[PDB]
Design a protein around this ligand. Structure first.
Ligand SMILES: CCCCCCCCCCCCCCCCCC(=O)OC[C@H](COP(=O)([O-])OCC[N+](C)(C)C)OC(=O)CCCCCCCCCCCCCCCCC
Ligand SMILES: CCCCCCCCCCCCCCCCCC(=O)OC[C@H](COP(=O)(O)OCCN)OC(=O)CCCCCCCCCCCCCCCCC
Ligand SMILES: CCCCCCCCCCCCCCCCCC(=O)OC[C@H](COP(=O)(O)OCCN)OC(=O)CCCCCCCCCCCCCCCCC
Ligand SMILES: CCCCCCCCCCCCCCCCCC(=O)OC[C@H](COP(=O)(O)OCCN)OC(=O)CCCCCCCCCCCCCCCCC
Ligand SMILES: *P(=O)(O)OCC(C)(C)[C@H](O)C(=O)NCCC(=O)NCCSC(=O)CCCCCCCCCCCCC
Ligand code: SF4
Ligand code: SF4
Ligand code: SF4
Lengths: 76, 425, 81, 242, 122, 186, 185, 67, 76, 80, 238
């Protein structure tokens, strides 16, 4: 499982799920294309669970959902 | 004709209940009335999450207000299956498992397993190994008592002696690292003697530490022995009579505190303890205060033995001189055919131990440590059972604490020298 | 579970003794005018409350003695009948 | 640094040279023959005093073992506790050994200590998966946890034991780990599951399987048969010639 | 009793009549305790579901015709009962007893030959 | 006195005005401070001990090149077998005595068959039945083996030259004196 | 309790002494009680320690002492020519008390007996030195290094590349430690 | 634990700038002879009149010093 | 671990806590505490020296020193 | 009493191990008439114990083998 | 001063106090042992062994006589005959009676020899004793009571209990003279089995042992033969 993350302390619980070498963490920003497709080029299945119910200073709902999906789906 | 005789249940087997003799009555010394009202006890769990005195200890107590009704220690939080693992190891490979039982008394732990294997091997180890092992035995006894007495003192509030004495631990841990390459798990005492000889400047460095250690003991006694808070915390606490201590399987200080003069080093001498002079501290009231005074005097007798070992240290080899049991020197292994073969076989197959069984006991710092080994003639032991003094001592916690104050339980947990690697194994 | 009566005693003896100390504080700021005559009454008052503390101590309502080999059998040989 | 006036450098004192070290060859078993006769006599006297339960005794070096039938556990240990010539008033250890080739697969081993006589004795009985042993808790309080350990590791019942429960294994643990047929890593293992938000037991799965080098045992016997050391007072007489 | 809360001294059964009473006594204590067991370990099942498991455990050994084996099973039942009614077990231990709460299911063996073969020995 | 001089205790000392201050204020001026001396303690470091000086010792019987055959010092293969006595053997030892002390002559023929009779009898009747047929006189004979009284268990220390108990006695020097409840046994 | 034979001389304690018979004066007895003399003496001991030098060293700027025998991070060594010392004897894999070593081997392209896999699971290793003792060529050694704590557990699964790099970096220590202790080995 | 005479002397031998810098990493006032420099730029010092085990010490080349 | 307030960290110290150690093949031992809790720093040794433990604590402090908290929220 | 019987039907009729409902009588037996084996009987007495909120001793429970035996037993017990 | 050891004085072994009448306690125990062994056959070595150790130790206990023993015995024997109803267990019970404030004493017969067991009120501070130690059985049942609860309240004790001052028809039991401290040490030096108190402990255990041995009939044939291979280890064939 490749897990692209933003905060290190937030993703710490995910490692317990798998054996050694099974849960892999990747530093990523949704506006860093290199990071998105470095996280995807080896995968045979990609889940997009990126969503947000509120807009933020850095991301409009369209920025995180529409532009977010579009960069990920193009990498896929 | 068991066990088919039990298929239909004939001839029940006699229990201890079937042999209860009525006491001799001549000489035997032993409405809404509020006296019939019952009292509800509350059962409190102590440990291991909620802080306890030390270690992986879940202590389940039934209390009547402030008094202990029933004490029920739950152990096995550090049960690691050591005894089973030893059956899949050679005797060499099982030796480090003994460092990790009473893990402040490493060299005497490995001493008891070496003596038992040496007994089944039918070999007499060289005199220099005997003196090194006795010397490191009393160094390890001081290391243990420094941990035991001072951490017991720290549990009842006395912060400072623990700090002073653990610098003494640091000095003696350097001697462990100089001989082996480890602060704690030396794997130094092996069947046949010790791994390697001591470096050529160690005896003098031990001697220099010895000239100042008496003052360290004395300054510890300046804060505790006459202190009225220390006495009021220990005197009359955790009393066990001499008769019950024997029936509860108490050994070491837990036995000598009740007045019984008994030391395994005196009763069944091993290594070089028959060649050294020392006294055995014995208490008279069987309480935490007597056991504290015995342990403080054991500090001085250990130092007294170490000084004798420094002067009586003979020359010669430190490993039994048969390369069929002990590994040859590395220069021999690279030089002649016979030595290289014996090196190859000892590190792949291991030495074969003649079949049989033995129970071997030593006076460990926490009391009588024993090991029961069964040999099948092969290079792996058939059975290794370890007799830990802390196991017998903690099994007596209910007997010594029932009817007494909850505020004295920390005193008797510390008066038993309790490391749970010993207890659970 | 039942609670310990010693907690009620500590609060009870504290309160009653706290009141008596309070009643002596006016004397300490009035000693000059009170002189000998006021001192007598203060000493009478102290003596009376001291007796109740003796009762406290003598009966050990705080359980002072809370925590604590003569043989009843003696045998005599008389011999053969 | 400020040195002590009377403490000179202990490394600076030259040591007397050491030359041709000579150490005699010692058989460590020889020193026990002095008491070999006495240990046989003590075992023989015990057999004579309790013939109904004592099947055999053995003397190895200074260790005397007594072999008894399970029913005599209480009478035999009573005698070893209370007899004036047997004041073995402490139980050093109780443990078990497994022998699957035996019908009674479990060998129960008791080690006793007599402080008065400065002596030790070993008592062996046997048990099965369904054949219990009398508890000696009524004679020795220290025996309580040792019997729980034997029951935990081997599954041996002690009738008359109060509170015979596990002492070492986890609660709800299945199996008796010191049985020879119990595998080293057992059957199951635990982990924290992030869905159940708790620890879960699962079938055991090792990332690296245990490697057993038992097959490297020597193809030749390396110890031999040993030496007979029975004293003369316990060997039968022999017919004289003619 | 005397040592700890639910401690039962180890005794042999005198006869088959004696054994049957203990077995029924053991079952009665178990299914009676089922309501307490639910709320004490917060089991996510009804007391009905828990009580069925109790009967099946007793039914695995219904066909035993050996007295010594019964004494062993009775001792195990008392030990499990004590460590349950005393809060010595943890929710993980009791929950592991319910075979449904394993992420691979309860039907952990193939239904027939061809399902196990198509998946690869189950 | 109990204390050794501070001038012989391998610790940093005070000097000048500070030593006089120390001897005037501390509880015991002979007490060290536990600080080791840098020119003497672990000097040189064990990693700079000259390797050529140390000699691996060899004891000449075990390490000779001339007169040490391995089988003479092979004490592992000369291990004692356990000496086992069953109920049959003790009955035979009671019926006809031992090799150190026989009960009857057992001279050649009619004694070889007599000796094997004592074996098959031991197998058939155990110790109890044997004693019961022979009576109380045999019981006195078993105790006659141990000198009338029953035997005592062997001791585990040989310091005095024989296996015996260790004779614990109070040390002539009591470390606590009598001011504390702990007694020194030697 | 006592050994067999006659009771040890003077084993029986004399009878307890009454308050009346105590050989200590009232003024001394009352003075120690109210003045807490032994507690004052214990406090005075602390002031003596307050003016003694502390034992503290300032780590990591200063380090505690270690010996040539010290058992730390594992390394694979070379000959002076640079050839690997390891010849795949498997002695270290067999003696290992924790089964921490895994080895595979065949003939190298030049026909030399060499390893293809040399892994040490540092989360299985008990740091006992048995491999270093069993090695006939001084190939596996424990370096003095102890400061290699890692962020992830996978970083503690050493393969042959990690171990040979460790030997290349630490070789002068490895030779010095071997130089000092080889006479005793 | 420096003591006044030790710290005052080392201050004079090193100056206040060096003194404050040393107080920023090691937290002590140490002075000794330069034994040498390693490949990374760490400086190593010796003084045999210090307390035991404090006679050797390193001044790290890098602000984020690591052992 | 569940009762520790945030921010929180776990240091696995020793071979046993790391991967099971000398008892990895035991029936009663967890083969590494990272099966149970997430681990921030692994300290090797059986036992690690006191200095080795201190080195690991220094690594975790350097980890805290590089933790982005107000800038992590400021990115998104 | 009669109030106990109307509560007795409330659980036996709800029991899923009865051979056939309406087979209950004022004196019906669990084994002979209702076709209950040993443990099903243990469970029925435990369900009655819950209804009357009174614990039943194991010896008393062994005595209870019929609908009438339970009706008689509950009346003797003060709690209900 | 130190001529006689003080009963209850600590011996040195914790919980083992100095014995009140140690010489007679040993005689009582040894004689009780020999009598209890008469129900074992004569071919039992167990019986032959206990006899040898006990009759040998018994001979040594008799070898040490308290000063003035002969003078005491004549009066004490003379006292039993004239007041036999005061010391017979069949009338006053094995404890000597229900009166603890007073002195009790019972004649008992073992091994052909007679012993008197005596019990005394515990020496307690007068500030703390109520009614001179008389047992508190609660208050009497006042009010409207049935006959049954009256009998359950020990009303019949009114017609049989005796006031502690009431000693008209009875006599004061005089204790045996005690061995001196010198005599105790030399006697236990003769036995060579530790302190007199430990020797008494061993006698009490040995007395307890006979009942187990008789109930187990340890002198009869082996109960269970070892089935083949039961005690076979890994020993190589010689
Ligand atoms: C000066 C103090 C005020 C500083 C200005 C306000 C803080 C920065 C502006 C908003 C930043 C929000 C960052 C939130 C975040 O990162 O989450 C992590 C956390 C908040 O986690 P959270 O997002 O779960 O917060 C939850 C909010 N509630 C509880 C209401 C739901 O932020 C922090 O840990 C605080 C870090 C900054 C505050 C440090 C104050 C120290 C002041 C010492 C003196 C400094 C003097 C300087 C001159
Ligand atoms: C010392 C002084 C330091 C001052 C640093 C100021 C940094 C705050 C900058 C505020 C900002 O630019 O963002 C606006 C922010 C809204 O937060 P936002 O992330 O857009 O929404 C997430 C969920 N609502 O609004 C804020 O969070 C402002 C919080 C008060 C400041
Ligand atoms: C609270 C504050 C502390 C108050 C106590 C500190 C003062 C203690 C004074 C000394 C007490 C005893 C004085 C005395 O006279 O003792 C003599 C007598 C027994 O004599 P003894 O010493 O035993 O003979 C030698 C045997 N080795 O012992 C006795 O008979 C007891 C006599 C007691 C008389 C005490 C008179 C002084 C009272 C001082 C009150 C202080 C008020 C100010 C605070
Ligand atoms: C700032 C200047 C220096 C300050 C010095 C402070 C000294 C340290 C203070 C620490 C706290 C005090 C510790 C007291 C320890 C304690 O409570 O001991 C209890 C002790 C028990 O004695 P008791 O119950 O009466 O029975 C004795 C028979 N075994 O009872 C006693 O021991 C009481 C004896 C002490 C009485 C002191 C009060 C009187 C002061 C002079 C008048
Ligand atoms: P009825 O005629 O239907 O049956 C009566 C019996 C059972 C006696 C049989 O007819 C019979 O003859 N059986 C043969 C002997 C026998 O009964 N064997 C003894 C078995 S005891 C037993 O099985 C104990 C198991 C207890 C398990 C309880 C549940 C598990 C513990 C966890 C609880 C849930 C989680 C907290
Ligand atoms: S490291 Fe040494 S012992 Fe291990 S395989 Fe290589 S050569 Fe053999
Ligand atoms: S140090 Fe010990 S445990 Fe670690 S790899 Fe070497 S032999 Fe195995
Ligand atoms: S020292 Fe070794 S055995 Fe002990 S806890 Fe640490 S890793 Fe485990």
């Amino acid at each position: 499982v490749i897990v692209p993350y933003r905060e290190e302390m937030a993703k710490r619980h995910l490692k317990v799920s798998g054996d050694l070498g099974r849960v892999i963490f990747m530093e990523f920003d949704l506006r860093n294309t290199q990071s998105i497709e470095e996280s995807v080029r080896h995968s045979d299945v990609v889940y997009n669970l990126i969503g947000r119910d509120y807009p933020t200073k850095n991301f409009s709902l369209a920025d995180v959902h529409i532009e977010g999906t579009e960069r990920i789906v193009e990498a896929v | 004709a068991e066990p088919q005789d039990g298929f239909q249940g004939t001839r029940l087997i006699p229990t201890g209940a079937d042999f209860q003799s009525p006491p001799d009555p001549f000489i035997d010394e032993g409405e809404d009335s509020v006296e019939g009202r019952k009292v509800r006890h509350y059962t409190v769990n102590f440990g291991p999450q909620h802080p306890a005195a030390h270690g992986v200890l879940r202590l389940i107590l039934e209390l009547n207000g402030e008094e202990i009704v029933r004490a029920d220690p739950h152990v096995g939080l550090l049960h690691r299956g050591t005894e089973k693992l030893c059956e899949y190891k050679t005797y060499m490979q099982a030796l480090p498992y003994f460092d990790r039982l009473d893990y402040v008394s490493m060299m005497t732990n490995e001493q008891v397993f070496s003596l038992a294997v040496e007994k089944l091997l039918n070999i007499e180890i060289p005199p220099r190994a005997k003196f090194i092992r006795t010397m490191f035995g009393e160094i390890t006894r001081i290391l243990n008592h420094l941990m035991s007495v001072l951490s017991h003192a720290m549990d009842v509030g006395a912060l400072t002696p623990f700090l002073w004495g653990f610098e003494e631990r640091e000095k003696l841990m350097e001697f462990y690292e100089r001989v082996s390459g480890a602060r704690l798990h030396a794997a130094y005492v092996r069947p046949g003697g010790v791994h390697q000889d001591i470096p050529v400047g160690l005896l003098d460095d031990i001697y220099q530490w010895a000239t100042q250690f008496g003052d360290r003991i004395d300054e510890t006694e300046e804060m505790l022995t006459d202190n009225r808070i220390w006495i009021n915390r220990l005197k009359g606490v955790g009393v066990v009579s001499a008769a019950d201590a024997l029936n509860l399987s108490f050994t070491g200080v837990m036995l000598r505190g009740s007045g019984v003069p008994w030391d395994v080093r005196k009763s069944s001498p091993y290594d070089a303890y028959d060649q050294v002079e020392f006294d055995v501290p014995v208490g008279i009231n069987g309480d935490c205060y007597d056991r504290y005074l015995c342990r403080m005097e054991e500090f001085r007798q250990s130092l007294r033995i170490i000084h004798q070992c420094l002067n009586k240290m003979p020359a010669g080899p430190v490993r039994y001189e048969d390369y069929k049991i002990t590994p040859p020197p590395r220069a021999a292994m690279k030089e002649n055919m016979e030595a290289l073969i014996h090196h190859f076989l000892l590190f792949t197959k291991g030495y074969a131990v003649p079949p049989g069984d033995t129970y071997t006991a030593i006076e460990a710092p926490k009391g009588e440590m024993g090991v029961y080994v069964v040999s099948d003639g092969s290079e792996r032991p058939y059975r290794v059972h370890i007799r830990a003094p802390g196991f017998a001592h903690l099994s007596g916690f209910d007997h010594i604490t029932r009817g007494h104050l909850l505020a004295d339980a920390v005193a008797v947990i510390g008066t038993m020298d309790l490391v749970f690697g010993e207890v659970d194994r | 579970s039942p609670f310990n009566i010693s907690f009620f005693i500590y609060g009870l003896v504290f309160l009653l003794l706290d009141l008596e100390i309070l009643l002596l504080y006016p004397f300490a700021v009035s000693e000059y005018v009170n002189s000998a005559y006021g001192l007598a009454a203060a000493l009478i008052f102290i003596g009376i409350i001291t007796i109740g503390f003796v009762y406290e101590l003598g009966h050990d309502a705080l359980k002072v003695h809370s925590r604590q080999l003569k043989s009843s059998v003696v045998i005599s040989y008389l011999g053969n009948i | 640094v400020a040195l002590p006036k009377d403490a000179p450098n202990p490394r600076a004192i030259p040591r007397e040279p050491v030359g041709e070290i000579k150490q005699a060859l010692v058989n460590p078993a020889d020193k026990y023959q002095s008491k070999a006769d006495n240990l046989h006599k003590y075992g023989a006297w015990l057999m004579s005093c309790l013939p109904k339960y004592i099947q055999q005794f053995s003397v190895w070096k200074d260790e005397l073992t007594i072999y008894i039938c399970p029913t005599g556990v209480i009478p035999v240990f009573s005698f070893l506790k209370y007899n004036t010539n047997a004041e073995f008033t402490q139980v050093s250890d109780i443990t078990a050994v497994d022998f699957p080739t035996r019908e009674m697969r479990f060998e129960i081993v008791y080690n006793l200590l007599s402080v008065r006589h400065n002596a030790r004795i070993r008592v062996k009985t046997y048990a099965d998966e369904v054949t219990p042993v009398p508890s000696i808790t009524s004679l020795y309080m220290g025996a309580n946890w040792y019997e729980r350990e034997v029951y935990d590791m081997f599954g041996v019942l002690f009738v008359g034991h109060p509170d015979l429960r596990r002492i070492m294994t986890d609660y709800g643990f299945e199996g008796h780990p010191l049985r020879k047929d119990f595998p080293l890593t057992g059957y199951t293992e635990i982990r924290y599951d992030e869905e159940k938000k708790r620890i879960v037991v699962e079938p055991l799965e090792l990332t690296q399987a245990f490697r057993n080098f038992e097959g490297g045992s020597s193809a030749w016997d390396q110890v031999g048969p040993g030496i007979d050391r029975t004293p003369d007072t316990f060997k039968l007489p022999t017919p004289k010639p003619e | 009793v005397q040592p700890t809360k639910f401690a039962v001294t180890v005794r042999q059964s005198r006869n088959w009549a004696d054994a049957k009473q203990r077995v029924i006594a053991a079952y009665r204590a178990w299914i009676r305790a089922a309501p307490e067991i639910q709320t004490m370990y917060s089991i996510p099942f009804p007391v009905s579901h828990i009580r069925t498991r109790i009967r099946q455990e007793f039914e695995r050994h219904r066909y035993v015709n050996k007295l010594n084996v019964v004494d062993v099973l009775l001792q195990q039942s008392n030990a499990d009962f004590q460590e349950t009614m005393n809060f010595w077990r943890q929710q993980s231990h009791v929950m592991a007893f319910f075979k449904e709460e394993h992420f691979r299911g309860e039907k952990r063996l193939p239904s027939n030959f061809i399902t196990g073969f198509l998946e690869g020995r189950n | 006195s109990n204390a050794v001089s501070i001038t012989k205790k391998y610790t940093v000392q005070s000097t000048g005005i500070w030593e006089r201050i120390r001897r005037a204020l501390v509880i015991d001026p002979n007490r060290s401070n536990g600080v080791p001396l840098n020119p003497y303690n672990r000097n040189p470091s064990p990693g700079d001990n000259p390797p050529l000086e140390y000699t691996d010792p060899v004891t000449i019987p075990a390490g000779d090149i001339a007169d040490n055959p391995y089988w003479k010092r092979d004490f592992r293969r000369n291990y004692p077998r356990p000496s086992v006595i069953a109920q049959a053997q003790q009955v035979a030892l009671l019926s006809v005595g031992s090799a150190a002390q026989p009960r009857v002559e057992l001279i050649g023929e009619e004694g070889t068959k007599a000796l094997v009779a004592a074996e098959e009898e031991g197998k058939e009747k155990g110790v109890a039945k044997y004693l019961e047929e022979k009576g109380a006189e045999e019981a006195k004979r078993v105790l006659a083996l141990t000198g009338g009284l029953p035997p005592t268990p062997s001791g585990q220390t040989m310091v005095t030259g024989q296996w015996d108990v260790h004779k614990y006695g109070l040390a002539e020097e009591q470390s606590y004196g009598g001011s504390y409840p702990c007694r020194s046994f030697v | 309790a006592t050994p067999a034979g006659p009771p040890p001389k003077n084993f029986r304690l004399p009878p307890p002494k009454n308050w009346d018979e105590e050989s200590e004066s009232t003024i001394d007895k009352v003075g120690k009680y109210f003045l807490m003399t032994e507690m004052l003496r214990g406090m005075y001991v602390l002031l003596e320690q307050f003016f003694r030098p502390p034992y503290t060293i300032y780590y990591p700027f200063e380090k505690g002492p270690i010996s040539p025998r010290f058992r730390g991070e594992h390394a694979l060594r070379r000959y002076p020519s640079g050839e690997e010392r390891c010849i795949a004897c498997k002695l270290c894999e067999a003696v290992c008390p924790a089964q921490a070593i895994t080895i595979e081997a065949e003939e190298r392209a030049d026909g030399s007996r060499r390893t293809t896999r040399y892994d040490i699971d540092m989360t299985k290793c008990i740091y006992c030195g048995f491999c270093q003792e069993s090695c006939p060529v001084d190939a596996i050694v424990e370096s003095p290094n102890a400061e290699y704590a890692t962020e992830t557990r996978e970083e503690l699964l050493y393969n042959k590349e990690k171990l040979l790099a460790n030997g290349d970096k630490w070789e002068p220590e490895l030779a010095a430690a071997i130089r000092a202790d080889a006479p005793y080995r | 634990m420096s003591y006044p005479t030790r710290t005052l002397a080392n201050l004079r031998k090193i100056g206040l700038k060096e003194y404050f810098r040393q107080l920023l990493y090691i937290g002590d006032t140490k002075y000794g002879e330069l034994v040498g420099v390693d490949k990374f730029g760490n400086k190593f010092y010796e003084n045999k009149e210090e307390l035991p085990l404090r006679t050797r010490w390193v001044d790290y080349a890098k602000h984020d010093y690591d052992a | 671990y569940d009762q520790m307030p945030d921010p929180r960290w776990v240091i696995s110290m020793g071979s046993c806590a790391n991967g099971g150690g000398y008892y990895h093949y035991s029936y009663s031992v967890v083969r590494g505490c990272d099966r149970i809790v997430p681990v921030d720093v692994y300290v090797p040794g059986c036992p690690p020296t006191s200095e080795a433990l201190m080195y690991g604590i220094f690594q975790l402090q350097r980890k805290m020193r590089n933790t982005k908290i107000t800038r992590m929220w400021y990115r998104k | 009493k009669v109030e106990v019987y109307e509560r007795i039907k409330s659980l036996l009729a709800g029991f899923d191990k009865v051979n056939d409902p309406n087979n209950i009588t004022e004196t019906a037996h669990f084994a002979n008439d209702l076709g209950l084996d040993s443990l099903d009987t243990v469970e029925v007495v435990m369900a009655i114990e819950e209804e009357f909120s009174i614990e039943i001793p194991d010896k008393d429970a062994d005595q209870i083998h019929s609908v009438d035996k339970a009706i008689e037993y509950i009346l003797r017990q003060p709690d209900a | 001063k130190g001529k006689f050891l003080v009963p209850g004085a600590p011996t040195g072994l914790t919980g083992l106090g100095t014995h009140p009448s140690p010489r007679s306690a040993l005689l009582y125990l040894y004689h009780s042992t020999l009598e209890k062994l008469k129900q074992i056959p004569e071919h039992s070595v167990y019986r032959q062994s206990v006899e040898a150790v006990t009759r040998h130790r018994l001979a040594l206990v008799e070898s040490v006589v308290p000063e003035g023993y002969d003078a005491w015995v004549e009066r004490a024997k003379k006292l039993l005959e004239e007041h036999a109803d005061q010391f017979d267990p069949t009338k006053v019970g094995p404890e000597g009676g229900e009166e603890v404030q007073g002195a009790r004493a019972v004649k008992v017969e073992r091994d052909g020899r007679v012993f008197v067991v005596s019990r005394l009120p515990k020496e307690e501070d007068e500030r703390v004793l109520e009614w001179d130690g008389e047992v508190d059985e609660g208050p009497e049942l006042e009010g409207s009571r049935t006959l049954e609860e009256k009998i359950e309240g020990g009303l019949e004790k009114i017609f049989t209990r005796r006031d502690v001052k009431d000693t008209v028809g009875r006599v004061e039991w005089e204790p045996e003279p005690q061995l001196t401290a010198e005599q105790v040490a030399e006697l236990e030096n003769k036995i060579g089995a530790g302190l007199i108190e430990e020797v008494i402990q061993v006698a009490e255990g040995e007395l307890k042992l006979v009942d187990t041995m008789v109930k187990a009939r340890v002198w009869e044939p082996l109960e269970e033969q070892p089935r083949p291979g039961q005690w076979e280890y890994f020993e190589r064939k010689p």
